[PDB]
Amino acid sequence: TYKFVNMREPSMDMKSVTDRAAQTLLWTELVRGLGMTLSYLFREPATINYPFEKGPLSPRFRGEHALRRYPSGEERCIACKLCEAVCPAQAITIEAEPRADGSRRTTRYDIDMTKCIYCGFCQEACPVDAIVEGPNFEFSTETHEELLYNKEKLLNNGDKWEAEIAANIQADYLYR
Amino acid sequence: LHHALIPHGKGGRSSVSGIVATVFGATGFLGRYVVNHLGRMGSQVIVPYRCEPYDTMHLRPMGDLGQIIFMEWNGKDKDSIRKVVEHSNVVINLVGREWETKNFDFEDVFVKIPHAIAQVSKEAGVEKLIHISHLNADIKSPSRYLRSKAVGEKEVRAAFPEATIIKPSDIFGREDRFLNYFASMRWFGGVPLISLGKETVKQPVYIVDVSKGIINAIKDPDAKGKTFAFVGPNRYLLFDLVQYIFAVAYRPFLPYPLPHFAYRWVGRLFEVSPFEPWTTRDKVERVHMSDMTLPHLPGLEDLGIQATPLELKAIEVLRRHRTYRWLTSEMEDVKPAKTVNI
Amino acid sequence: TRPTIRPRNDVVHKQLSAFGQYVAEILPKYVQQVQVSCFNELEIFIHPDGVIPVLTFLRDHTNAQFKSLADLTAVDVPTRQNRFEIVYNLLSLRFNSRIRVKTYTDELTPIESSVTVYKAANWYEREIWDMFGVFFANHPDLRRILTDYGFEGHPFRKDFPLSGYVELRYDDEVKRVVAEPVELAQEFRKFDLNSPWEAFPAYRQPPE
Amino acid sequence: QLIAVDEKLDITTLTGVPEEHIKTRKVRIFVPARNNMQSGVNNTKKWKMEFDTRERWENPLMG
Amino acid sequence: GTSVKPIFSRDMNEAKRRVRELYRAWYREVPNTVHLFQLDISVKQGRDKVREMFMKNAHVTDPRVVDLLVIKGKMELEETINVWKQRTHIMRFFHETEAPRPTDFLSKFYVGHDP
Amino acid sequence: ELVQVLRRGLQQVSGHGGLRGYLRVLFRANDVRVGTLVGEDKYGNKYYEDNKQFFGRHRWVIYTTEMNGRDTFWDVDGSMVPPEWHRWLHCMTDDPPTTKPPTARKYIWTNHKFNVSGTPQQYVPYSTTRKKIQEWVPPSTPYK
Amino acid sequence: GVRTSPTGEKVTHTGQAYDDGDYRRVRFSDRQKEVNENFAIDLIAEQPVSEVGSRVISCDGGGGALGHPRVYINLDKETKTGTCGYCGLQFRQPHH
Amino acid sequence: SRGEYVVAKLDDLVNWARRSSLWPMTFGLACCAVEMMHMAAPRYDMDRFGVVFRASPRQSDVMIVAGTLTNKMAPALRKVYDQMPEPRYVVSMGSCANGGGYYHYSYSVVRGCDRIVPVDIYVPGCPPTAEALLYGILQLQRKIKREKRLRIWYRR
Ligand SMILES: CCCCCCCCCCCCCCCCC[C@@H](O)O[C@H](CO[C@H](O)CCCCCCCCCCCCCCC)COP(=O)(O)OCC[N+](C)(C)C
Ligand SMILES: CCCCCCCC/C=C\CCCCCCCC(=O)O[C@H](COC(=O)CCCCCCC/C=C/CCCCCCCC)COP(=O)(O)OCCN
Numbered sequence A: 001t002y003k004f005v006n007m008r009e010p011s012m013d014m015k016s017v018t019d020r021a022a023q024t025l026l027w028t029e030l031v032r033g034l035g036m037t038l039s040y041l042f043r044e045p046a047t048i049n050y051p052f053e054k055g056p057l058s059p060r061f062r063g064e065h066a067l068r069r070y071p072s073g074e075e076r077c078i079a080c081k082l083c084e085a086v087c088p089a090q091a092i093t094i095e096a097e098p099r100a101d102g103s104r105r106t107t108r109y110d111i112d113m114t115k116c117i118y119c120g121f122c123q124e125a126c127p128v129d130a131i132v133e134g135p136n137f138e139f140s141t142e143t144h145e146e147l148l149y150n151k152e153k154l155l156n157n158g159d160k161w162e163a164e165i166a167a168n169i170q171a172d173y174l175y176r
Numbered sequence B: 001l002h003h004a005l006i007p008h009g010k011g012g013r014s015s016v017s018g019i020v021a022t023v024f025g026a027t028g029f030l031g032r033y034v035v036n037h038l039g040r041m042g043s044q045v046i047v048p049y050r051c052e053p054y055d056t057m058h059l060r061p062m063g064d065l066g067q068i069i070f071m072e073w074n075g076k077d078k079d080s081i082r083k084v085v086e087h088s089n090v091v092i093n094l095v096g097r098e099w100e101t102k103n104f105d106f107e108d109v110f111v112k113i114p115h116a117i118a119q120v121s122k123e124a125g126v127e128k129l130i131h132i133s134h135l136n137a138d139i140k141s142p143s144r145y146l147r148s149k150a151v152g153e154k155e156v157r158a159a160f161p162e163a164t165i166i167k168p169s170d171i172f173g174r175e176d177r178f179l180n181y182f183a184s185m186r187w188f189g190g191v192p193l194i195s196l197g198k199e200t201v202k203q204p205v206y207i208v209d210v211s212k213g214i215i216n217a218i219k220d221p222d223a224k225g226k227t228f229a230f231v232g233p234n235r236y237l238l239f240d241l242v243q244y245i246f247a248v249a250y251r252p253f254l255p256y257p258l259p260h261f262a263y264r265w266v267g268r269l270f271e272v273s274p275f276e277p278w279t280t281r282d283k284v285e286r287v288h289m290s291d292m293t294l295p296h297l298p299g300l301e302d303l304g305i306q307a308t309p310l311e312l313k314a315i316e317v318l319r320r321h322r323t324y325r326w327l328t329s330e331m332e333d334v335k336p337a338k339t340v341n342i
Numbered sequence C: 001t002r003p004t005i006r007p008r009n010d011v012v013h014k015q016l017s018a019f020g021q022y023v024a025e026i027l028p029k030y031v032q033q034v035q036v037s038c039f040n041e042l043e044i045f046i047h048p049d050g051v052i053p054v055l056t057f058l059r060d061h062t063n064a065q066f067k068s069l070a071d072l073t074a075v076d077v078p079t080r081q082n083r084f085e086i087v088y089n090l091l092s093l094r095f096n097s098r099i100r101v102k103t104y105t106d107e108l109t110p111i112e113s114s115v116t117v118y119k120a121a122n123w124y125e126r127e128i129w130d131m132f133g134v135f136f137a138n139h140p141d142l143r144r145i146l147t148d149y150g151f152e153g154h155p156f157r158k159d160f161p162l163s164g165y166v167e168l169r170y171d172d173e174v175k176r177v178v179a180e181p182v183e184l185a186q187e188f189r190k191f192d193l194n195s196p197w198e199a200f201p202a203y204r205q206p207p208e
Numbered sequence D: 001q002l003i004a005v006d007e008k009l010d011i012t013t014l015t016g017v018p019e020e021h022i023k024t025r026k027v028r029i030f031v032p033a034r035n036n037m038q039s040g041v042n043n044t045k046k047w048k049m050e051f052d053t054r055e056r057w058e059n060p061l062m063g
Numbered sequence E: 001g002t003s004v005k006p007i008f009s010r011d012m013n014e015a016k017r018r019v020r021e022l023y024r025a026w027y028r029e030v031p032n033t034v035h036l037f038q039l040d041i042s043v044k045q046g047r048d049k050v051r052e053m054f055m056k057n058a059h060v061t062d063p064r065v066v067d068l069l070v071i072k073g074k075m076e077l078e079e080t081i082n083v084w085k086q087r088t089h090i091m092r093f094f095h096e097t098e099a100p101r102p103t104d105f106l107s108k109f110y111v112g113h114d115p
Numbered sequence F: 001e002l003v004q005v006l007r008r009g010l011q012q013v014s015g016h017g018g019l020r021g022y023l024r025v026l027f028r029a030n031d032v033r034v035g036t037l038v039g040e041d042k043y044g045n046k047y048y049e050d051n052k053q054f055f056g057r058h059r060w061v062i063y064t065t066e067m068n069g070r071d072t073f074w075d076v077d078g079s080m081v082p083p084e085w086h087r088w089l090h091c092m093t094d095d096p097p098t099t100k101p102p103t104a105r106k107y108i109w110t111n112h113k114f115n116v117s118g119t120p121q122q123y124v125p126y127s128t129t130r131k132k133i134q135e136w137v138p139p140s141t142p143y144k
Numbered sequence G: 001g002v003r004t005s006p007t008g009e010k011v012t013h014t015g016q017a018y019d020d021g022d023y024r025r026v027r028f029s030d031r032q033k034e035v036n037e038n039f040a041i042d043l044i045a046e047q048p049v050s051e052v053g054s055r056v057i058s059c060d061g062g063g064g065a066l067g068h069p070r071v072y073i074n075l076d077k078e079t080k081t082g083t084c085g086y087c088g089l090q091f092r093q094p095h096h
Numbered sequence H: 001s002r003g004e005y006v007v008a009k010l011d012d013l014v015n016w017a018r019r020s021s022l023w024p025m026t027f028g029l030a031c032c033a034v035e036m037m038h039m040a041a042p043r044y045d046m047d048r049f050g051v052v053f054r055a056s057p058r059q060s061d062v063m064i065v066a067g068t069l070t071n072k073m074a075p076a077l078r079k080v081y082d083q084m085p086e087p088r089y090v091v092s093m094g095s096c097a098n099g100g101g102y103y104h105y106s107y108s109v110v111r112g113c114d115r116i117v118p119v120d121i122y123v124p125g126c127p128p129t130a131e132a133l134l135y136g137i138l139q140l141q142r143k144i145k146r147e148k149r150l151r152i153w154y155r156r
């Protein structure tokens, strides 16, 4: 099932010929294009006043990573290393040992943010919702070293963004 | 050696060399080469700077991640020097200005600052200090630059008895003042030389040779309290040297003699520029002063460096000074200059 | 077996089997094997000397008419004496069908260039040469296409390391980009994922 | 046409491997041992070639 | 026997002839390369490097391997002549930023664990 | 008519608290629109909406002139918005934090920090693990 | 549960602080060292032990699908308490 | 001092002009370039900040590395960086340019463009959104505001 895009023949009558001569000599289609641009001149521009105005986002948006806690203040991460296994960029580095109270916790948890592709596979893989991609996207640095996150930086991100992260998870977890 | 400072790897960019170096004067001609050679091996390099951070940007790609740390410092402040040498096992001093500014005379950059660095780094427990003076440093030289160099050399030796003192002579390189200075003279018309440069002998040394010599002196256990002189393999009369420079640049060479007092007056006239001067009286004195001969000092061949002749590296400095007509001429086309060796 | 299992098509399977028999009967000099995969894809394993005849037949025969070369590539299997497996994928618009032609070679044996049969192969054969080191005889202009100028070795070969042997960086002393032996801040971490329990009984090999 | 080459096969000059990684290397050809933590034997069917272990060190940043 | 198919040469004599032809072409090209790329080497250095690269593969006794080596050298020559290559590519042959790695036992023992 | 548009302009300058407030908002945000104050920040940012604007221009923040320690009369950036107002402002939800406050936890930061890159408060990476190999300590006493 | 080393550096939850002769401390001069102040081991040690009238209790960390996988904890040993291996909460039977 | 006040005012004026008129080179490597296009599109309209693309390196102030830098391409990137008159700035945009990203362990990829050129701003993401790149651009403007070349010169 197909149609032709350029298989139309022009009328040869005198009226048609005079209209085409007027189009050639008086430049009618060029005035049509000028009219289209003039029409767009009087529309409201689609520009937003950044940083005062922001682009719309979604609860599913993938941003800067964060490590979360239980409401008691205990960390959620148990060092299963599923995020490290699934990461397609090998951006996650994990070292773990028994804590002083025998708990299964990490001693090293790094994410190399210049390796990361921000795919969100790690938060899918995490069985306790410990690693998340938070909503933040304005974290440009002036040096490369500032983008090599350790466990302290990620725990600080979790502490700083928990209020919004929990509200985002509440709005999306029933689709997961 | 403090396990964290044990050498590891194959001596490359991501290796650990065991060196933690603070390089004063790293934003100059010699400093960029020194920092490049240190960061090649995987050294931790601490760069004290007082200039605009923009001016340090070219030093950023010289190391791996975290291997180059930039810190603000003030030459008149000793707490700042303490701050920047606290964790280093090597301190290299490359601070120096050819001309004298309103806030810093020759004695400030060549006596006070080197002595303060030596004292503070000795107090901090720094293992090694490398100081750079001139080959022609002398207490009674006509140039105040060299008098200050000699005084500062003695001061550093007094404040850090195990310091390695290196005495190069007229380093030439792409950013070198020396090859460029002669090149600069062509715009005026004639090359003014005192006595037509027939009474001056120069022994210029390549920049990479000096950087390699510094690096090797760091790694040399018996170079602790030594004094080295870094000189090239050939000696030239100034006239022949400038003639060779003009032949490599393919510019017409028009030398003329200029009396000493006239040249001093010209240098004084050029000295009043608020920016970097084109020349000074001190520069005029240093240009027409013969390089000393110090056979009793260890040289580059005692540090394992084979000196590079100027005939092999002149084109890489002077091709920029050619016109489009001669821009593609090969290196072996210029008939090396006459050497007055012995 | 209904909702989550991919449905079968026996009509296309029969048609492809019959056409494979057709091709094998017409060209016994080169055709070594004919296969119809379970999802209805027809493959013809031939001798290298028959690369040009077979393809030409498959392009010009009235009952074939595979006038389009969809893809041409190589697979490296180091355990085989002939390391490299050359795979041609052809599409017939007249009969709305696809065919695969496979042959083999090793490091030192050229394959006939098929630019004459298909103009599309030019860059495909250049790419195979660049990535695998398989020389193609009588190629109009055979040179590297994907790799850097002066790059040594072939990256797609199984033996070649993932990160290669050299890296690049800008060096200020020579004022240019230089190539040096690779050093890695963090080594790629090799994972051993293969399960010690067999997954597919239908593919079990005899115990030798 | 056949030319009857008489010599042993040797492709080192074509592979592009630096000579350091051709002469000083030792490979191990072996069937890997069964992992004693499990009873499956499916990982003990094929032969493996692997190179000798070289130096690994600690990154000054991030370790 | 051994039942092999050639690339271009049937014995080592034809392969040596092709090697000599490629060597002639590289020898002629070196001065033009030094001029066009504005290299700071001499023509003598470039021809010495060409000879060194040719002598790296002097031990080859297989005509097919020699044919492939000549094909690769011709690829490199075509690449150099057309200026597809840049000055960095030409200078990669000289390893100017690589520190000399020692070969005697004692220095290797001092630096690290690798033989 | 045109006169009603001019009257809208005059009530816009009148609606920002006088001519000097009008000039302040014009030079601080390059915008002089008037909207309903949705709420304020504990750091001084004010949040307005106007549902008659098209999607994207219907919510905005006038930033504070004085954040944690720095003068932000001219130097503002999007990282100064705290997470709850961040969720409202980027239209992740319709409910402002004033009417739908976030859940309270004692480990959540009580004081939002902005992007501290290029500042003595910047993050510096380091290894968080302990030493692996311990070396032998020779005895402090002479052996002969 | 923060505490400083004899060098004045904060000690992390992990317990790593650079040694006195370690040059790497230079990376913090003119900058700061990132340390998270909410120590999880201390925060979980403040939670009260839950008393339940059954031998086997269940824990899912709260929030249902927002917690951890549901596990069952035996509470027969009376010399200790049953501790969740995911959340760290403690459970016991009414004793004495 | 009057001289210090004068150099401070001249410093501010020059810094203001440079930040206000930032011209990036029309240059894109991979996926990230698409988001760069979306920064120039109506919704964000980088032109309203004084940020206009120009093809020539001689008429450019900023280079945005927006995409993977391979080994084959690194000499060309270095060359067009060197042909920028000074002052010049480099914004590294995306995981590939920042550190290699998804192709960090490749035989043909440069592990971060800061091996080839000095970088001022690192914009994270794969790709960073147009808003994140705009945030990085305004951060570069803020960094240019902090420079004091004239004050440094006077102190010398
Ligand atoms: C006869 C004249 C000869 C010389 C002519 C030269 C041109 C005349 C000078 C014109 C100067 C106008 C530029 C100054 C405008 C400053 C604009 C102001 O808003 O900048 C503020 C800060 O001002 C600057 O710090 C100082 C600018 C002026 C500095 C002193 C100028 C003195 C001029 C003297 C002229 C001397 C000429 C010398 C040669 C003869 C901060 O704004 P900014 O943070 O960006 O905003 C970001 C965007 N936001 C706000 C929406 C977020
Ligand atoms: C009683 C005796 C009277 C004497 C005679 C008077 C009557 C004359 C009637 C004819 C007058 C026609 C004059 C027009 C001249 C050009 C016509 C023409 O044919 O040009 C076009 C092309 O000319 C153009 O269209 C120009 C293209 C670029 C357009 C740029 C912008 C468009 C103009 C915007 C508005 C112009 C406003 C001009 C007035 C400004 C006020 C000073 C031909 O090109 P093609 O269509 O490709 O076909 C020819 C080959 N097959």
Ligand SMILES: NC(=O)C1=CN([C@@H]2O[C@H](COP(=O)(O)OP(=O)(O)OC[C@H]3O[C@@H](n4cnc5c(N)ncnc54)[C@H](OP(=O)(O)O)[C@@H]3O)[C@@H](O)[C@H]2O)C=CC1
Binding pocket: B024, B025, B026, B027, B028, B029, B030, B031, B050, B051, B075, B093, B094, B095, B096, B097, B098, B104, B109, B132, B133, B134, B135, B167, B168, B169, B170, B171, B172, B177, B178
């Ligand atoms: N021909 C030669 O080049 C020879 C050089 N030497 C000596 O070797 C050393 C290196 O020389 P070179 O690289 O040519 O010198 P440069 O002028 O190129 O650089 C000197 C460095 O010292 C810094 N500096 C200068 N004055 C001060 C000050 N008052 N306070 C703080 N820092 C200061 C400069 O910093 P900033 O960037 O802020 O200006 C600059 O980085 C010098 O000490 C020189 O005397 C010895 C013999 C021959």
Ligand SMILES: C=C(C)[C@H]1Cc2c(ccc3c2O[C@@H]2COc4cc(OC)c(OC)cc4[C@@H]2C3=O)O1
Binding pocket: H026, H027, H028, H029, H030, H033, H034, H036, H037, H040, H053
């Ligand atoms: C100039 C404006 C208004 C837009 C268009 C534009 C940019 C910035 C960069 C480029 C560009 O368009 C050109 C041509 O089309 C593609 C298509 C590309 O892939 C779709 C691509 O990726 C590198 C790059 C390009 C060019 C490119 O670099 O801003």
Ligand code: SF4
Binding pocket: A083, A086, A087, A088, A089, A090, A091, A092, A111, A115, A116, A117, A118, A119, A120, A121, A122, A123
């Ligand atoms: S988002 Fe993807 S690439 Fe980034 S850490 Fe998670 S799994 Fe790895």
Ligand code: SF4
Binding pocket: A076, A077, A078, A079, A080, A081, A082, A083, A084, A094, A125, A126, A127, A128, A129, A130, A131
């Ligand atoms: S973050 Fe989640 S997936 Fe990763 S180690 Fe911790 S518990 Fe496992």
Ligand code: SF4
Binding pocket: H030, H031, H032, H033, H066, H067, H068, H093, H094, H095, H096, H097, H101, H102, H125, H126, H127, H128
């Ligand atoms: S960082 Fe991601 S989006 Fe950007 S060029 Fe690389 S792969 Fe593409």
Ligand SMILES: [Zn+2]
Binding pocket: G059, G060, G061, G068, G084, G085, G086, G087, G088, G089
């Ligand atoms: Zn629990």
